[PDB]
Amino acid sequence: RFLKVKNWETDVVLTDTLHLKSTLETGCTEHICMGSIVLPVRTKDQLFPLAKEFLDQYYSSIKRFGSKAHMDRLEEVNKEIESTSTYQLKDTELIYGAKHAWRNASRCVGRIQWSKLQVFDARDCTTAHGMFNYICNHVKYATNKGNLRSAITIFPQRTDGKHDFRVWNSQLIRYAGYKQPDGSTLGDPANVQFTEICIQQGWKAPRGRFDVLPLLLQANGNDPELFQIPPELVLEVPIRHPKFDWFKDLGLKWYGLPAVSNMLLEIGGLEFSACPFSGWYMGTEIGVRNYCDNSRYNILEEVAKKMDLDMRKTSSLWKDQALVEINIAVLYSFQSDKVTIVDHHSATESFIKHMENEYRCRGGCPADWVWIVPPMSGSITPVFHQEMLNYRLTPSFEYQPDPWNTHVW
Amino acid sequence: RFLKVKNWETDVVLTDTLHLKSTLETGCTEHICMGSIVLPVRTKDQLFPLAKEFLDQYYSSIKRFGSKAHMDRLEEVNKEIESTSTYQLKDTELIYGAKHAWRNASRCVGRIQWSKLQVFDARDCTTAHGMFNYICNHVKYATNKGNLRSAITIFPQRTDGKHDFRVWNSQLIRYAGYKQPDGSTLGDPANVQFTEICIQQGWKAPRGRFDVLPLLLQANGNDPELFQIPPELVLEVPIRHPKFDWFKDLGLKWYGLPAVSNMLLEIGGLEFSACPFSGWYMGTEIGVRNYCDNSRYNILEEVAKKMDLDMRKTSSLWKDQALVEINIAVLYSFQSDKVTIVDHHSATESFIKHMENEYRCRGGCPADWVWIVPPMSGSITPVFHQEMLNYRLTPSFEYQPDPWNTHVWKG
Numbered sequence: 001r002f003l004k005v006k007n008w009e010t011d012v013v014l015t016d017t018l019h020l021k022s023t024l025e026t027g028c029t030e031h032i033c034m035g036s037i038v039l040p041v042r043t044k045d046q047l048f049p050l051a052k053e054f055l056d057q058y059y060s061s062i063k064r065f066g067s068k069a070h071m072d073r074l075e076e077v078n079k080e081i082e083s084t085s086t087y088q089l090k091d092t093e094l095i096y097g098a099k100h101a102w103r104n105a106s107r108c109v110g111r112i113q114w115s116k117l118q119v120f121d122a123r124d125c126t127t128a129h130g131m132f133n134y135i136c137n138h139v140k141y142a143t144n145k146g147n148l149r150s151a152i153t154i155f156p157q158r159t160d161g162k163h164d165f166r167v168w169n170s171q172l173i174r175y176a177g178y179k180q181p182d183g184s185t186l187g188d189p190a191n192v193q194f195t196e197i198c199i200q201q202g203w204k205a206p207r208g209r210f211d212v213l214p215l216l217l218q219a220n221g222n223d224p225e226l227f228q229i230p231p232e233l234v235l236e237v238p239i240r241h242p243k244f245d246w247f248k249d250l251g252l253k254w255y256g257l258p259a260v261s262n263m264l265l266e267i268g269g270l271e272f273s274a275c276p277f278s279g280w281y282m283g284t285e286i287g288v289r290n291y292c293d294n295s296r297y298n299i300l301e302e303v304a305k306k307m308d309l310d311m312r313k314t315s316s317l318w319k320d321q322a323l324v325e326i327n328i329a330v331l332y333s334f335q336s337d338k339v340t341i342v343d344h345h346s347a348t349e350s351f352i353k354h355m356e357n358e359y360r361c362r363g364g365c366p367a368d369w370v371w372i373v374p375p376m377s378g379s380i381t382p383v384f385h386q387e388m389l390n391y392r393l394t395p396s397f398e399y400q401p402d403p404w405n406t407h408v409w
Numbered sequence: 410r411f412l413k414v415k416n417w418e419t420d421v422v423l424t425d426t427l428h429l430k431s432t433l434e435t436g437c438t439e440h441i442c443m444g445s446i447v448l449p450v451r452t453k454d455q456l457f458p459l460a461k462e463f464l465d466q467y468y469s470s471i472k473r474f475g476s477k478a479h480m481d482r483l484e485e486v487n488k489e490i491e492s493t494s495t496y497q498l499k500d501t502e503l504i505y506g507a508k509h510a511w512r513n514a515s516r517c518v519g520r521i522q523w524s525k526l527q528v529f530d531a532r533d534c535t536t537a538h539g540m541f542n543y544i545c546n547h548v549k550y551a552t553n554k555g556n557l558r559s560a561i562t563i564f565p566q567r568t569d570g571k572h573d574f575r576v577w578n579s580q581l582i583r584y585a586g587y588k589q590p591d592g593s594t595l596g597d598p599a600n601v602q603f604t605e606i607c608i609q610q611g612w613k614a615p616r617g618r619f620d621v622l623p624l625l626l627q628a629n630g631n632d633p634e635l636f637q638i639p640p641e642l643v644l645e646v647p648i649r650h651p652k653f654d655w656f657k658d659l660g661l662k663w664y665g666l667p668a669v670s671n672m673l674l675e676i677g678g679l680e681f682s683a684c685p686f687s688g689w690y691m692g693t694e695i696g697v698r699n700y701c702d703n704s705r706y707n708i709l710e711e712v713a714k715k716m717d718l719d720m721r722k723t724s725s726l727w728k729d730q731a732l733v734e735i736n737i738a739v740l741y742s743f744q745s746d747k748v749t750i751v752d753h754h755s756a757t758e759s760f761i762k763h764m765e766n767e768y769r770c771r772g773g774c775p776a777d778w779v780w781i782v783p784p785m786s787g788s789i790t791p792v793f794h795q796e797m798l799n800y801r802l803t804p805s806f807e808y809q810p811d812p813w814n815t816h817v818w819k820g
């Protein structure tokens with residue numbers, strides 16, 4: 001019932017009590033652990049307990065638990081559900097809901113920042129053109145000329161589920177992917193299917209390695225439409241190395257703003273299916289995953305060749321050498337251009353501090369070790385040595401089906 | 410029930426049916442994942458089911474399920490249990506059981522090797538000196554002058570839990586760790602407590618950075634006894650770097666033979682509390698953890714100093730740089746001395762091949778991702794991209810508490 005987690009590097013032990021509030025299921029059982037698995041409307045009756053549970057935590061957080069304003073609010077929501085079959089969040093509840101969805105994201109190493117999130121209320125939005133305007137303003141505000149600020153923009157909540165707002169893109173800013181007659185792939189292979197839906201919806205693709213995708217915005221369950229983010233709002237960094245002069249000849253660049261736009265935000269049983277949110281990069285996301293994944297840009301082979309390393313035996317660790325340098329270059333490039341970026345030592349150090357705060361201040365912190373530990377130098381970052389408990393709290397961000405599997409035309 | 414695992418580099422989807430034979434519990438619930446927690450006397454009653462299940466396993470595998478010889482052996486084990494309250498494994502069953510414990514070890518990346526395992530039966534052993542002897546022969550056979558061979562030596566099973574065979578060292582070969590007045594440590598910090606004990610028992614401590622510890626051996630529930638492994642049996646590798654000539658002057662070496670000795674082997678209900686086993690190192694065990702953990706030898710600073718890296722901001726990746734070079738040195742040094750070692754690229758690639766084979770032949774392969782993925786360069790090894798399912802099969806290796814915590818001293 002009361003659980004301990006130990007850090008094996010510091011011997012510091014923490015007691016978790018927050019897990020007993022978890023509602024949703026993990027994928028695991030007593031018989032099987034699904035820890036490494038990437039992926040393991042409401043009626044009037046389902047919605048009300050959800051609303052109450054949420055409002056209860058809200059009013060407790062503002063130290064007004066059991067007060068007349070608490071009781072009255074519970075009344076008003078119940079009455080709205082009974083007659084309208086849904087309800088509207090107050091601004092204050094919405095800000096709180098969003099922030100706690102981030103506080104609760106067990107896969108996010110950057111949650112020390114959870115309270116500093118700028119919430120843009122876009123529930124008055126009605127069209128795709130409106131969505132586009134909200135998005136460009138988010139993108140510009142968050143970017144802040146390279147001094148990035150965390151933000152989320154929240155579109156209208158789901159109704160009967162035939163009137164969903166969706167950003168089709170997986171991030172507001174991503175690069176196209178094209179399959180070539182050559183049999184290979186130019187650009188980001190992670191994006192082929194989506195790039196094809198952009199060309200099939202009308203986009204003129206420049207057919208480059210780094211083509212910023214057009215936004216595919218769906219309002220009120222309507223057919224999605226294309227828009228191009230003003231190029232001057234897309235801050236990109238050319239990638240160079242502080243010692244290797246030849247590194248820039250690789251042609252590499254990345255965008256400054258990581259902004260996830262395909263997730264579904266659940267607050268008090270209400271479902272916000274379009275809720276693009278953004279912060280700033282940890283270096284490894286680009287240098288390790290985007291650049292070096294075999295299924296991504298896959299440049300290790302080419303980089304190692306430029307450093308003149310022995311690629312005949314895996315045991316020369318040429319991959320590992322090239323990986324370090326690629327990641328040095330990413331960090332250096334973002335820093336030289338004054339675009340906020342955090343390295344994995346710094347991020348994990350910070351997440352450790354954040355865990356300790358969440359344990360004393362909340363009695364816990366759901367954390368997913370498989371995602372928290374960076375994809376390089378795992379054991380030299382402190383999160384490696386830290387036991388974590390993983391459980392699902394609400395409010396939350398969740399994955400949801402790609403809209404094209406779902407929405408018909 | 411048919412559970413699927415996806416590989417996200419390759420899109421290969423595998424179907425697990427073998428988790429259906431898992432009995433032991435994982436620590437996880439529908440409400441909580443304990444996937445990253447390190448550590449989450451039997452009666453007649455529970456024993457025959459465990460025996461029966463184990464022997465059904467054995468007999469199926471040799472294609473004799475339901476045979477007269479299978480039925481006779483069930484009957485004979487049955488009788489032996491109600492008459493003596495325990496039972497004895499045939500040699501063939503011990504061999505088969507010890508291989509399977511390794512096969513079922515979900516935290517072990519080395520399992521493509523599982524069928525090649527040298528089983529030494531030390532169930533006739535009765536004294537600590539007997540154990541010393543059996544262990545030396547293990548060390549020599551397994552070392553094989555650098556061409557390492559996998560082995561396990563199996564001492565008599567638990568009886569009333571009052572007459573346990575324990576090897577008290579965590580590995581047959583490890584270096585001492587000495588805590589100084591000033592708070593520093595000399596030698597391996599992880600063996601401090603266990604060194605203290607040895608000192609206490611009578612070991613005269615050399616007090617250097619790589620003193621190979623004595624064996625502290627318990628036979629038959631008796632107080633444990635000190636012994637020195639013959640130094641000529643302890644193969645070591647001095648660590649140097651192919652390009653960095655200053656690297657040798659760091660003074661580093663490691664031993665060639667990793668041989669876990671503190672684990673409990675369970676076969677068909679029986680508990681072998683002394684079953685030291687050995688294979689050969691993946692490089693990162695030494696170069697990442699033993700050398701570079703902050704709680705271990707912690708040589709990152711001193712290595713990055715000597716490479717003259719920019720050490721004033723973590724963002725130069727100076728740690729990542731030094732870490733790679735040290736790991737290059739470890740593999741270089743082993744290869745040059747013809748001591749078996751495997752790098753983490755080759756080890757993980759082999760395991761994927763193993764794992765795929767296991768799904769195809771056996772219907773699954775339980776695997777602990779948190780353990781399988783190497784502690785450096787995670788996502789450039791294919792295991793990182795591999796979904797895994799963790800579950801508990803017997804026969805099995807398990808943790809047990811440390812003997813000094815439980816042992817009832819006689820004097």
Ligand code: HEM
Pocket residue numbers: 098102105107108109110111113117150151152277278279280281282285342347371397
């Ligand atoms: C501010 C700096 C931030 C950093 C350094 C950061 C870091 C990360 C990293 C490294 C991941 C792993 C993602 C991957 O590898 O694909 C992640 C996941 C995630 N982050 Fe954060 N994050 C930040 C801000 C935010 C914000 C502002 C939110 C929401 C308000 C958020 C919500 C999430 C969610 C829901 C996931 C899991 C996504 C998934 O499962 O695919 N993050 N984060």
Ligand code: HEM
Pocket residue numbers: 507510511514516517518519520522526559560561672686687688689690691694751756780806
């Ligand atoms: C032959 C080459 C082998 C290699 C390279 C290898 C590699 C590894 C590695 C890297 C680990 C994780 C250990 C750690 O970081 O603490 C491990 C754990 C383990 N291995 Fe293997 N192994 C090998 C052979 C064997 C053998 C012969 C056995 C027993 C028959 C075995 C049984 C286990 C068990 C039970 C664990 C879990 C240890 C624990 O949970 O603390 N392995 N192995």
Ligand SMILES: Cc1cc(N)nc(C[C@H]2CNC[C@H]2NCCNCCc2cccc(F)c2)c1
Pocket residue numbers: 038039258259260277278279280281282285399
């Ligand atoms: C907000 C924020 C800040 C930050 N630094 N980093 C992030 C993760 C972003 C950026 N870099 C990767 C991307 N990650 C979010 C997308 N994750 C897909 C995971 C996935 C894939 C396939 C099937 C699934 F069920 C799940 C977000």
Ligand SMILES: Cc1cc(N)nc(C[C@H]2CNC[C@H]2NCCNCCc2cccc(F)c2)c1
Pocket residue numbers: 447448519667668669686687688689690691694808
């Ligand atoms: C047989 C074999 C071969 C190989 N290559 N590698 C091995 C693992 C060994 C060597 N390098 C580390 C060690 N691993 C086994 C002991 N590890 C500690 C597990 C542990 C720690 C603390 C608390 C616990 F509850 C459990 C075995």
Ligand SMILES: C[C@H](O)[C@H](O)[C@H]1CNc2nc(N)[nH]c(=O)c2N1
Pocket residue numbers: 035036037038370371372417793794795796797
């Ligand atoms: C199979 C495995 O779950 C998958 O590769 C995970 C592992 N850890 C991860 N961790 C992070 N942060 N991001 C990821 O995309 C992944 N992928």
Ligand SMILES: C[C@H](O)[C@H](O)[C@H]1CNc2nc(N)[nH]c(=O)c2N1
Pocket residue numbers: 008384385386387388445446447779780781
């Ligand atoms: C807390 C966490 O589970 C712990 O540090 C684990 C992580 N993965 C590991 N993996 C291996 N192979 N060996 C280890 O000692 C550990 N330690």
Ligand SMILES: [Zn+2]
Pocket residue numbers: 028029032033034035437441442443444
């Ligand atoms: Zn689990």
